[PDB]
GROMACS .gro file of C-alpha atoms in nm:
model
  421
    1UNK     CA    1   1.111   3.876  -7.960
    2UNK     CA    2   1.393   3.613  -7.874
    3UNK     CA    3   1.179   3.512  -7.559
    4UNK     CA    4   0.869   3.447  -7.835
    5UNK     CA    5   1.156   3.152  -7.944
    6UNK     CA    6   1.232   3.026  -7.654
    7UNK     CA    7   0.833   3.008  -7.538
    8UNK     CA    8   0.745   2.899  -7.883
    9UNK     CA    9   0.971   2.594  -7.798
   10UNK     CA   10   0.861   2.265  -7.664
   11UNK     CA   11   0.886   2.236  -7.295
   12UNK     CA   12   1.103   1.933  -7.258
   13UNK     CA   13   1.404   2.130  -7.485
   14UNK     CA   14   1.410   2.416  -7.291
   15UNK     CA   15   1.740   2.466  -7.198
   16UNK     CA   16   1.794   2.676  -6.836
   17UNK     CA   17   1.917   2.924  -7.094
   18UNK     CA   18   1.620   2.977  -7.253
   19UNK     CA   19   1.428   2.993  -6.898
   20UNK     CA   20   1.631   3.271  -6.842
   21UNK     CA   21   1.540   3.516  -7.119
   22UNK     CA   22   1.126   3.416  -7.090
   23UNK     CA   23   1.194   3.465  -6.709
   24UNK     CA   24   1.332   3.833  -6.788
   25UNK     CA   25   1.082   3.910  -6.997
   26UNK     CA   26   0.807   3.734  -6.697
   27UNK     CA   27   0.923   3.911  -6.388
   28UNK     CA   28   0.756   4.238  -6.485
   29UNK     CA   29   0.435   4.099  -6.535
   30UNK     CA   30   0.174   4.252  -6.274
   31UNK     CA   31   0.024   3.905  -6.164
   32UNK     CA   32   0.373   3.810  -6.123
   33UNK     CA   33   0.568   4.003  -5.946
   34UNK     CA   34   0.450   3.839  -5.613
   35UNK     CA   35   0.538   3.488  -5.717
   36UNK     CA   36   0.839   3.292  -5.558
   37UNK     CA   37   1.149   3.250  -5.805
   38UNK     CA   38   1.089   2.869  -5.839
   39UNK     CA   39   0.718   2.888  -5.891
   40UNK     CA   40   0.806   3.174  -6.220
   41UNK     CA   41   1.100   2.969  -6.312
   42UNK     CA   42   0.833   2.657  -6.359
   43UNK     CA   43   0.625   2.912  -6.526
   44UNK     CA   44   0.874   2.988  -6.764
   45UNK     CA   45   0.947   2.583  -6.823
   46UNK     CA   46   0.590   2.461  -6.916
   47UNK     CA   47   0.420   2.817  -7.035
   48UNK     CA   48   0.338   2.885  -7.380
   49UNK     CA   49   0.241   3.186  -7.608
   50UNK     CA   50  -0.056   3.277  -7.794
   51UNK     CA   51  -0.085   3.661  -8.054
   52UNK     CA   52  -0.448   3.715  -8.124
   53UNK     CA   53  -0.589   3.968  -8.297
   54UNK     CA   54  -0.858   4.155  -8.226
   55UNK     CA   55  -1.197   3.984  -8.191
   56UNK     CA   56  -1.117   3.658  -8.137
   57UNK     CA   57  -1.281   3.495  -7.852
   58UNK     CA   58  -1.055   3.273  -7.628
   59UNK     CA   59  -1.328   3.074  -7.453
   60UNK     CA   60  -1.675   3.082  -7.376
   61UNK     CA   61  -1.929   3.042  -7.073
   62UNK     CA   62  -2.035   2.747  -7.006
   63UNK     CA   63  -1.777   2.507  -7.140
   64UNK     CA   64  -1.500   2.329  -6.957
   65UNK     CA   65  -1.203   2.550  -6.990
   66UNK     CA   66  -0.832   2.407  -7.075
   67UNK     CA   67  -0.613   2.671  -7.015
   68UNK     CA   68  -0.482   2.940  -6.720
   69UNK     CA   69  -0.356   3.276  -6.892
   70UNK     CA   70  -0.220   3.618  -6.855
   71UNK     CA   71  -0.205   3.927  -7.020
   72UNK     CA   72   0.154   4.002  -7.192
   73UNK     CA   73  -0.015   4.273  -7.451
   74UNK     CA   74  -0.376   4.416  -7.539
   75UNK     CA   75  -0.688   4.343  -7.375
   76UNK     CA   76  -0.951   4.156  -7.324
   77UNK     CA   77  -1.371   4.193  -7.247
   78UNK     CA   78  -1.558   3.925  -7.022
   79UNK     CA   79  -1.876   3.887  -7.106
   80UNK     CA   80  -2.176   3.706  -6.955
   81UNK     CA   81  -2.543   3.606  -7.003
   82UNK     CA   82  -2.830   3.552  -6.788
   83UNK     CA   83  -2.973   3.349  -7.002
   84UNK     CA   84  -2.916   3.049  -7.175
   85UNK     CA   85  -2.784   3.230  -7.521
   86UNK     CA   86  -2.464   3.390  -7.564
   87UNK     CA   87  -2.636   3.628  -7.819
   88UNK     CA   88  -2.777   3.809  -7.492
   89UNK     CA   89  -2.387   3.813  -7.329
   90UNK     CA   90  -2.335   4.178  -7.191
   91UNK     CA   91  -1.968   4.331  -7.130
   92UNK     CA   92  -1.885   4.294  -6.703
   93UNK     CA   93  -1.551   4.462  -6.748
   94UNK     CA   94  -1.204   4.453  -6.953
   95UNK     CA   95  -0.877   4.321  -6.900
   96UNK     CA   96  -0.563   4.470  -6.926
   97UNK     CA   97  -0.181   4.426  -6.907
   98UNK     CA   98  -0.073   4.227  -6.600
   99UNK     CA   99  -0.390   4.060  -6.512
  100UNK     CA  100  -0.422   3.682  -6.545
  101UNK     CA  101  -0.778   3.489  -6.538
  102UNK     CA  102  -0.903   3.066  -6.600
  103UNK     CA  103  -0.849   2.966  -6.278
  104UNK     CA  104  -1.151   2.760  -6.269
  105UNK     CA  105  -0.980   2.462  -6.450
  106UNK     CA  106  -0.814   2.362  -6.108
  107UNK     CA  107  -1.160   2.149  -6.015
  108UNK     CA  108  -1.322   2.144  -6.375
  109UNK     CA  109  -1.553   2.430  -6.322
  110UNK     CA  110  -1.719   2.552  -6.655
  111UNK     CA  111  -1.630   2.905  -6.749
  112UNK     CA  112  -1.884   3.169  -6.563
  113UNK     CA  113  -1.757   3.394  -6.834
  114UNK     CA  114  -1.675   3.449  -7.237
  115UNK     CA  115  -1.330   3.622  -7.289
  116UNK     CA  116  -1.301   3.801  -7.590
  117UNK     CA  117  -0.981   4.071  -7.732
  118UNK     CA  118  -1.059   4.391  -7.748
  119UNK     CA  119  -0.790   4.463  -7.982
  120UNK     CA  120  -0.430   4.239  -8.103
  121UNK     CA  121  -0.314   4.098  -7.754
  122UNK     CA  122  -0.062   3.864  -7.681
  123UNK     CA  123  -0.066   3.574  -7.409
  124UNK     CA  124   0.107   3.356  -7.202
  125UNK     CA  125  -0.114   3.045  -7.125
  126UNK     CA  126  -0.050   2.759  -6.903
  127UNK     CA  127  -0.218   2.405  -6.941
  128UNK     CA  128  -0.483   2.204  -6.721
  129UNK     CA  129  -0.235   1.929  -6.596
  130UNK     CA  130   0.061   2.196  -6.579
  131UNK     CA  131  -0.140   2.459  -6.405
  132UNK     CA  132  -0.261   2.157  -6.110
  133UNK     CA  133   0.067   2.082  -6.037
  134UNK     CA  134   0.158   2.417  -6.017
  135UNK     CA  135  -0.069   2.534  -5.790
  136UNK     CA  136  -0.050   2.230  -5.534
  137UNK     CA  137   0.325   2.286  -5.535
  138UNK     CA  138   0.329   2.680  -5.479
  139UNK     CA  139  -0.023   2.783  -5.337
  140UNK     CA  140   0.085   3.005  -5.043
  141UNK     CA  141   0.183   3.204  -5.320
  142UNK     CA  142  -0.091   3.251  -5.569
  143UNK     CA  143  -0.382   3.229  -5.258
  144UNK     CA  144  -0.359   3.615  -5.281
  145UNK     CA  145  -0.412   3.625  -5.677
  146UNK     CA  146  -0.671   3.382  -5.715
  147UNK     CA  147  -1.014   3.437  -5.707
  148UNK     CA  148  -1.227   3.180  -5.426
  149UNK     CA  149  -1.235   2.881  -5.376
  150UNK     CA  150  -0.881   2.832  -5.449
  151UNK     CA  151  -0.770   3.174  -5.344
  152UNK     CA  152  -0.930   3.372  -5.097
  153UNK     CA  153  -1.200   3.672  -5.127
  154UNK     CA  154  -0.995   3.939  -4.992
  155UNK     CA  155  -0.607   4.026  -4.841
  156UNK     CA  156   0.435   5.401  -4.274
  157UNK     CA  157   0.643   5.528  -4.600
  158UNK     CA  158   0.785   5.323  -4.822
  159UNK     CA  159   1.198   5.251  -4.825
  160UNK     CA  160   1.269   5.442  -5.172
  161UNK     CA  161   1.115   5.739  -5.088
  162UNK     CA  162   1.193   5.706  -4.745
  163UNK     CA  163   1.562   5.756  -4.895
  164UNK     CA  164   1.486   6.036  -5.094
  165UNK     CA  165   1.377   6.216  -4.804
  166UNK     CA  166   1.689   6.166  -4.590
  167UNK     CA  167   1.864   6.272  -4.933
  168UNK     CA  168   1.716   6.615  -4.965
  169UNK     CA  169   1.728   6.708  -4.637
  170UNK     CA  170   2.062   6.667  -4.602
  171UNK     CA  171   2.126   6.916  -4.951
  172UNK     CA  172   1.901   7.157  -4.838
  173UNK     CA  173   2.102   7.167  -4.500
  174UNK     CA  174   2.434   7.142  -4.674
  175UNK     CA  175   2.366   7.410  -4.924
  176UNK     CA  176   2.079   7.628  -4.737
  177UNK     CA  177   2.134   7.596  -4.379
  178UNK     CA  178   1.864   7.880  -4.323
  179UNK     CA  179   1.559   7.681  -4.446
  180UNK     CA  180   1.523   7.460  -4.199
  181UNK     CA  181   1.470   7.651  -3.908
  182UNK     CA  182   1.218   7.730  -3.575
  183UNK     CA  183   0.983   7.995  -3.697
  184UNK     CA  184   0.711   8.164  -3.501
  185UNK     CA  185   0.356   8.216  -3.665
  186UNK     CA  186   0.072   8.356  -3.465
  187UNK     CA  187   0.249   8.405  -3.097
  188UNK     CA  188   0.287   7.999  -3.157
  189UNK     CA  189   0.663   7.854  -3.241
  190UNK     CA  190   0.681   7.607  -3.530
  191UNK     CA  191   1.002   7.412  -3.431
  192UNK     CA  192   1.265   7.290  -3.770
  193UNK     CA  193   1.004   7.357  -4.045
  194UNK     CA  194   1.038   7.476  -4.416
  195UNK     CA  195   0.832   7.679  -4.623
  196UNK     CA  196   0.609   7.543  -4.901
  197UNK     CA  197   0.736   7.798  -5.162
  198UNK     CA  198   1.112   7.783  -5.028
  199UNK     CA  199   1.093   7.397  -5.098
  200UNK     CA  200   0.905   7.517  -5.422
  201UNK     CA  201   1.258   7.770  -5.482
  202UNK     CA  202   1.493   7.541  -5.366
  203UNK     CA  203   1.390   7.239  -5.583
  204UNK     CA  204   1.375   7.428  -5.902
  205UNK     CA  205   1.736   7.609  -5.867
  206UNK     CA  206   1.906   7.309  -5.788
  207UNK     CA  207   2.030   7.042  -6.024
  208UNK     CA  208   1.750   7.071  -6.355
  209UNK     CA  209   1.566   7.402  -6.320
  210UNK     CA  210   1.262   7.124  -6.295
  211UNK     CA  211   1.074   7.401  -6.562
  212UNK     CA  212   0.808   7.503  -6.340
  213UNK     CA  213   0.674   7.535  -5.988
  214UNK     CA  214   0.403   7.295  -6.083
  215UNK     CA  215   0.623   7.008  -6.124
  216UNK     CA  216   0.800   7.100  -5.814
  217UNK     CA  217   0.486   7.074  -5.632
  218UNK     CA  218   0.449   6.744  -5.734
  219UNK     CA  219   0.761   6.623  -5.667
  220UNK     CA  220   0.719   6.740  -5.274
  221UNK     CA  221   0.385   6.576  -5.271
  222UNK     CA  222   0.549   6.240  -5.363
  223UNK     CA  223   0.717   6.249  -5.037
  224UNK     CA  224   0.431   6.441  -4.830
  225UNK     CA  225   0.179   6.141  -4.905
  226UNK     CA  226   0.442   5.876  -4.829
  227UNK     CA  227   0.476   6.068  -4.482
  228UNK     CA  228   0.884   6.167  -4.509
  229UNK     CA  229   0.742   6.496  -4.544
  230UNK     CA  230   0.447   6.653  -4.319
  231UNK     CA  231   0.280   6.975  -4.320
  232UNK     CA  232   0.332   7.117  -3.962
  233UNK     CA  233  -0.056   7.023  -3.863
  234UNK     CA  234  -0.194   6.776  -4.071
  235UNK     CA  235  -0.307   6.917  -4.440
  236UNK     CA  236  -0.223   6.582  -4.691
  237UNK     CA  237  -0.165   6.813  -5.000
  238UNK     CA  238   0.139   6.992  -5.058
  239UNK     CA  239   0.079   7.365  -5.158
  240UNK     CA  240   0.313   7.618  -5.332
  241UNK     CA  241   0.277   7.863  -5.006
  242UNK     CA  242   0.305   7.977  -4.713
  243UNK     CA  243   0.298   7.686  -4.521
  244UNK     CA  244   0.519   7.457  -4.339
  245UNK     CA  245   0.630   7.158  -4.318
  246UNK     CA  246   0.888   6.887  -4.156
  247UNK     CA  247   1.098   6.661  -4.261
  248UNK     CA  248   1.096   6.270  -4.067
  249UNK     CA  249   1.460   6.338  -3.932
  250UNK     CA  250   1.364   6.616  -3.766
  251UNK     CA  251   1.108   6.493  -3.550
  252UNK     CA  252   1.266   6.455  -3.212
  253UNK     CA  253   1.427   6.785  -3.047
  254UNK     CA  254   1.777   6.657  -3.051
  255UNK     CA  255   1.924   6.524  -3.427
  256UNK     CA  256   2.219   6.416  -3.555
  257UNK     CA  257   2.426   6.609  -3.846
  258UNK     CA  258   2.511   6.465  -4.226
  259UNK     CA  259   2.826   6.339  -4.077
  260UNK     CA  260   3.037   6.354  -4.406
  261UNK     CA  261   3.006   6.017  -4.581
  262UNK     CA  262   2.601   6.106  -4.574
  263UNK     CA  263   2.699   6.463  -4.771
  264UNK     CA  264   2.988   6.258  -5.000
  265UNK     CA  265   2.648   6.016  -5.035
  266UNK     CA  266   2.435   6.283  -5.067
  267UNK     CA  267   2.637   6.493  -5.327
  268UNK     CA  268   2.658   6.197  -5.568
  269UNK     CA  269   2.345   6.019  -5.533
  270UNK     CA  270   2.099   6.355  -5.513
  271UNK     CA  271   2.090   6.380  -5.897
  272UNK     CA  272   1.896   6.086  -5.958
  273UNK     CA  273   1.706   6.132  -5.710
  274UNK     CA  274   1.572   6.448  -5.858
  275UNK     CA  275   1.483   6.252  -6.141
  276UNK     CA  276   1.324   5.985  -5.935
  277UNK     CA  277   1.100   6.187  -5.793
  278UNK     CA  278   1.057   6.358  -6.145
  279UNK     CA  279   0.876   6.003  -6.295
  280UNK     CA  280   0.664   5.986  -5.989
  281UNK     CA  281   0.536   6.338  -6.007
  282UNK     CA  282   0.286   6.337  -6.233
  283UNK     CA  283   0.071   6.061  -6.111
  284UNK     CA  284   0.091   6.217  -5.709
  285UNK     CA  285   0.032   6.543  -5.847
  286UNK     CA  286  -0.321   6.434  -6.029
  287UNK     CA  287  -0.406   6.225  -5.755
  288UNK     CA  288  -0.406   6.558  -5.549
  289UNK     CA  289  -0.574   6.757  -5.847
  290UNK     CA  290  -0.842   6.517  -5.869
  291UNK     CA  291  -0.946   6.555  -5.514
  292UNK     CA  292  -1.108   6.916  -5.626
  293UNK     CA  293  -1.460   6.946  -5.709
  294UNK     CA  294  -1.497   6.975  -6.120
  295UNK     CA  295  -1.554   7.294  -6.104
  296UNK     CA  296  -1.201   7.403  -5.902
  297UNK     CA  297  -0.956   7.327  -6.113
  298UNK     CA  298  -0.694   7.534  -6.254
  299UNK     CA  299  -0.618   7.594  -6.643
  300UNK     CA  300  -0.271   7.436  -6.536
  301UNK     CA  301  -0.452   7.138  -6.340
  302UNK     CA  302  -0.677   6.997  -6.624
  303UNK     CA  303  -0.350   7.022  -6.793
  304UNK     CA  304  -0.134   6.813  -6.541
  305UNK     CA  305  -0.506   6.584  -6.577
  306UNK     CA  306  -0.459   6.523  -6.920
  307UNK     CA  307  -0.092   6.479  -6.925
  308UNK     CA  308  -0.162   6.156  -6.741
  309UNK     CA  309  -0.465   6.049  -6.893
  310UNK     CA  310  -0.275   5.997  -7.225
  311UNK     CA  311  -0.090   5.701  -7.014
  312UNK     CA  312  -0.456   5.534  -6.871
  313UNK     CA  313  -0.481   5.269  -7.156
  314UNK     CA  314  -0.876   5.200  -7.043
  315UNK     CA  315  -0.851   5.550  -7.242
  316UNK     CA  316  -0.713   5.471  -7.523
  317UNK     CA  317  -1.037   5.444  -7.747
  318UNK     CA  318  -1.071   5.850  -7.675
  319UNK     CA  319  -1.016   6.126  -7.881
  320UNK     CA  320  -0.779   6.397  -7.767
  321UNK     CA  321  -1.006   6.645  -7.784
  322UNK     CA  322  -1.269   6.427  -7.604
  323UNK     CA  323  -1.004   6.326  -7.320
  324UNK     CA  324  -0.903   6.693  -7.249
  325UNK     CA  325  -1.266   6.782  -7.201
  326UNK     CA  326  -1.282   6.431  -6.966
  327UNK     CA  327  -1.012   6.572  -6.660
  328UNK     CA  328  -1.228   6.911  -6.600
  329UNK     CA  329  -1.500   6.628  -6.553
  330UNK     CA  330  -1.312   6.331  -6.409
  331UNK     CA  331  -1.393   6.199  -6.036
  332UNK     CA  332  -1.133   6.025  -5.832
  333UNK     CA  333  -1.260   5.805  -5.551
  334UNK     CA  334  -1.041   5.570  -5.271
  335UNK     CA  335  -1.167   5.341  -5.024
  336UNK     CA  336  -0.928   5.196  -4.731
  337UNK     CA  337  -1.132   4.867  -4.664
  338UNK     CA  338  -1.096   4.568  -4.826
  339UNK     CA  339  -1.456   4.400  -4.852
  340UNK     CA  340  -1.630   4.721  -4.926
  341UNK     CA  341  -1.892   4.684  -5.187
  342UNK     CA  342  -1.855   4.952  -5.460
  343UNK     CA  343  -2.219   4.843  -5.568
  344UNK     CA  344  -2.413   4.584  -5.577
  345UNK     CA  345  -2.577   4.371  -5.860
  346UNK     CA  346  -2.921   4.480  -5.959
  347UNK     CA  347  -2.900   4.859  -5.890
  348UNK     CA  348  -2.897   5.149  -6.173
  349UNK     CA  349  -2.536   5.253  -6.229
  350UNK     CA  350  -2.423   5.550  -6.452
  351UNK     CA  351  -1.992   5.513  -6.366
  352UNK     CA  352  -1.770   5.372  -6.527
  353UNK     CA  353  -1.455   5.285  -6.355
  354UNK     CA  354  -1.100   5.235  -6.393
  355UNK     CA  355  -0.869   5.077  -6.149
  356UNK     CA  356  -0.576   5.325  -6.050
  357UNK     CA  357  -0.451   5.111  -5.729
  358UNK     CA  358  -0.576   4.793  -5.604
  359UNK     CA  359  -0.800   4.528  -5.705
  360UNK     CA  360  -1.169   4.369  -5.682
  361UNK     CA  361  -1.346   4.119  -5.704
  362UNK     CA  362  -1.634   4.073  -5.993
  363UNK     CA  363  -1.942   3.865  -5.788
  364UNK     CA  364  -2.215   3.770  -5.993
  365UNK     CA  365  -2.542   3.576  -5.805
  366UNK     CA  366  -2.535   3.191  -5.791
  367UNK     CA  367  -2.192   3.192  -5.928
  368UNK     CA  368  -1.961   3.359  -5.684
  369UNK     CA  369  -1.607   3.535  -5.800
  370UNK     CA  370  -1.641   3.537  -6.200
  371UNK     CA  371  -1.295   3.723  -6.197
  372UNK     CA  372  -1.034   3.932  -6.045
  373UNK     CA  373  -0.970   4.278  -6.183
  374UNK     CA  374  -0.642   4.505  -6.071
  375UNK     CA  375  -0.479   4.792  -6.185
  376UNK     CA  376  -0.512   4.897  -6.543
  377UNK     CA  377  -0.891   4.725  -6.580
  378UNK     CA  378  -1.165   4.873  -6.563
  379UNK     CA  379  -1.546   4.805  -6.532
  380UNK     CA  380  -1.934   4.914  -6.604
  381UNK     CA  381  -1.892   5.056  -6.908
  382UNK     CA  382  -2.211   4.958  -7.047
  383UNK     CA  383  -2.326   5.219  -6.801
  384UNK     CA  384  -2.255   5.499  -7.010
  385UNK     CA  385  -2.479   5.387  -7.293
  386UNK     CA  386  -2.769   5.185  -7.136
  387UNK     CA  387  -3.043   5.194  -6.858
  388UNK     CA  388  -3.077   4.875  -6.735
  389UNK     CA  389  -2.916   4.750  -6.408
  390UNK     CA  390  -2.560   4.627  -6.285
  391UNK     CA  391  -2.564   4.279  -6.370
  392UNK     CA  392  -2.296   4.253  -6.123
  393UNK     CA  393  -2.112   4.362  -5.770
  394UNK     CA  394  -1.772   4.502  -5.758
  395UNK     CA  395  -1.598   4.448  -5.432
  396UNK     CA  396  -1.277   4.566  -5.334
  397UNK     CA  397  -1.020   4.285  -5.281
  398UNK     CA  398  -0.786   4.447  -5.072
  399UNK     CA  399  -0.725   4.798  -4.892
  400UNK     CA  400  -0.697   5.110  -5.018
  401UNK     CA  401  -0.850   5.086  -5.374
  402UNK     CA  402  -0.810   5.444  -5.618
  403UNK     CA  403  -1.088   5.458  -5.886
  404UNK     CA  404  -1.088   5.673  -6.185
  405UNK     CA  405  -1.470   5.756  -6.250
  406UNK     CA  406  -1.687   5.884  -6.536
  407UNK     CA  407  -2.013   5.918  -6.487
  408UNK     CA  408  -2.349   5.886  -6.792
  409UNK     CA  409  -2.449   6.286  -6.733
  410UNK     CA  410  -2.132   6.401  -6.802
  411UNK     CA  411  -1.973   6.187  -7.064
  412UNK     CA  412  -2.245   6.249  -7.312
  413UNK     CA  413  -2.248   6.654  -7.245
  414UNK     CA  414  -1.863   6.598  -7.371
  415UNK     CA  415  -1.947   6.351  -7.682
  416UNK     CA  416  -2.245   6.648  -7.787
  417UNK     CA  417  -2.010   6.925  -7.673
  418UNK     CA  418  -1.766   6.761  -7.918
  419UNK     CA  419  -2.016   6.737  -8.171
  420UNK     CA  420  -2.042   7.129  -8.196
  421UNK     CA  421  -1.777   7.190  -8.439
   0.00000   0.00000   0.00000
């Protein structure tokens, strides 16, 4: 709330000191976290702060816009007509946390869109003149967030987990040698492999008994998808079984040994490591669930479903009961290329979607790139409740996009199913 203060303050007596605590409180947000340190540090210099409540509507289509904004808290719905009153505006999609939209005031271009909250939401907004100067002085580095003309239409494990994986294997051969070993199959030798439900054992009996095997599974899986960890053939789900699989290091025939300072390194930092892998669990673990037909899903996986659900804020206007019936029902959907057209304006629709990992583009005919949506948002809605057409295209801004989906048949057998009580 101090930050509030220092935002609520006039630009030219902002002390550096005050830049400091709005820039701490800045460097988390989404939109942000790509943006050079000068370019946030402006940000936090000329930026100011707007609490709405719900209903209010921050701008409408048509007019000549004033501000550039993003999302510090709530939500927001962008609506748009085809016609020439706002009375016939239908929702497009909702904005959440992270996501920042008005970039048509760099060349005057009238809002394609009305913004109103969905519920109290907090701002930070940047002025016309401000934003300009802004952008002319740190484009390279907002080309990738802004929708065309002034950004453009579209845009190996990772180094943490990549750690994690050296950090395991080296416990597991500290403390049990015997699980990494050659073992022979079906008159075929699998060379340095582990067992799915060894892992599964080892995990749980080590530092935390983790609770369950479920939760171990998911923890494995974390590392499996990143590729530190690969089943011997090629399977990309981890399973509690007989299966095996290798870890990076031991790739090539020869391989060095946890000389010391890795197992003094190892010993201390292992703990947290467990717990790392612990946050990111959950999510890898339903992104695995999700990938079986409705109708193949365990007591235990519409379980680890829900669990997560409860953090999708897109979901947050759902009963509990009505959400628990929505993961034996839930689709999941990915697509690797960037430019690929989830659908197109002017054909029936019956999803709605939410964005789990990526972004896209909103294109509506005539006016190009209305908005930007990422992670969080979601879009087509209306689709659940009415018959006529999308009166829009969704296209993926960037590779490998992960969709939540809910489709019109089976959302309404839930909100009747729910109604037998």
């Amino acid at each position: 709330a101090e930050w509030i203060a220092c935002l609520d303050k006039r630009p030219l007596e902002r002390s550096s000191e005050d830049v400091d605590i709005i820039f701490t409180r800045l460097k988390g947000v989404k939109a942000f976290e790509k943006f050079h340190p000068n370019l946030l540090r402006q940000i936090c210099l000329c930026g100011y702060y707007e609490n709405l409540e719900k209903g209010i509507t921050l701008f409408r289509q048509g007019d000549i816009g004033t501000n550039w904004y993003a999302v510090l808290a709530g939500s927001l719905d962008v609506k748009v007509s085809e016609t020439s009153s706002h009375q016939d505006a239908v929702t497009i999609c909702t904005l959440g946390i992270g996501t920042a939209f008005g970039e048509s005031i760099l060349d005057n271009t009238p809002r394609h869109a009305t913004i109103v909250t969905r519920e109290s939401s907090e701002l930070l907004r940047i002025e016309q003149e401000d934003f300009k100067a802004l952008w002319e002085k740190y484009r390279q580095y907002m080309a990738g967030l802004l929708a065309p003309p002034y950004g453009v239409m579209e845009t190996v494990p990772s180094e943490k987990i990549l750690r994690a994986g050296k950090i395991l294997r080296i416990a597991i051969l500290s403390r049990a040698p015997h699980m990494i070993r050659d073992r022979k199959y079906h008159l075929k030798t699998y060379r340095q492999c582990c067992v799915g439900t060894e892992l599964v054992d080892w995990m749980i009996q080590q530092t935390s008994c983790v609770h369950s095997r479920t939760q171990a599974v998911g923890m494995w899986q974390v590392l499996l998808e990143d590729g530190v960890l690969n089943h011997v053939d090629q399977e990309r789900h981890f399973q509690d079984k007989y299966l095996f699989y290798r870890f990076l290091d031991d790739e090539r025939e020869d391989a060095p040994l946890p000389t010391e300072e890795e197992k003094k390194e190892c010993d201390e930092e292992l703990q947290d490591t467990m717990l790392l892998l612990s946050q990111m669990g959950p999510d890898a673990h339903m992104r695995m669930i999700l990938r079986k037909p409705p109708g193949q899903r365990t007591v235990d996986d519409l379980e680890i479903i829900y669990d997560e659900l409860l953090h999708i804020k897109a979901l947050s206007h759902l009963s509990t009961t009505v959400k628990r019936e929505l993961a034996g029902v839930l689709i999941f959907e990915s697509h690797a290329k960037g430019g690929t057209v989830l659908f197109n304006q002017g054909e029936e629709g019956t999803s709605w979607y939410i964005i789990l990992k990526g972004s896209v583009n909103v294109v509506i005919y005539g006016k190009g790139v209305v908005c930007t949506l990422h992670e969080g948002d979601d879009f087509g809605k209306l689709a659940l409740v009415n018959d006529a057409p999308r009166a829009a295209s969704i296209v993926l801004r960037e590779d490998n996009c992960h969709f939540l989906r809910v489709d019109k048949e089976d959302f309404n057998r839930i909100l009747r199913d729910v109604e037998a009580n």
